[PDB]
Design a protein around this nucleic acid. Sequence first.
RNA 1: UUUUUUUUUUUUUUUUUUUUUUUUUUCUCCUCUUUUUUUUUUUU
Length: 58
Amino acid sequence: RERENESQESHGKEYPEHLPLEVLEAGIKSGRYIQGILNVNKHRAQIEAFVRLDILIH
RNA sequence: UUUUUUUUUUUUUUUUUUUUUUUUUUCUCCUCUUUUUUUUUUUU
């Protein structure tokens, strides 16, 4: 009963689609985008992703 | 004492040509464990 709900609440997209650069210059300048290096744990390597300014990416 | 006649190896040579490696499939796919991540230092 779960199965149909998870498979029909997934549609036809797997990852957020990217977008142009002029957006990213502006979003930096206006001050709504930080940017740093990104590393991952290695005991847990599908969950514990870090965004060196640390931002936890789950 | 036994004469005379019954052809034979197809004829021919003095014709133009402006393309080009290959060639045509097989789907989506659960990476298990003390961690933040350690870090100067000196002898190559």
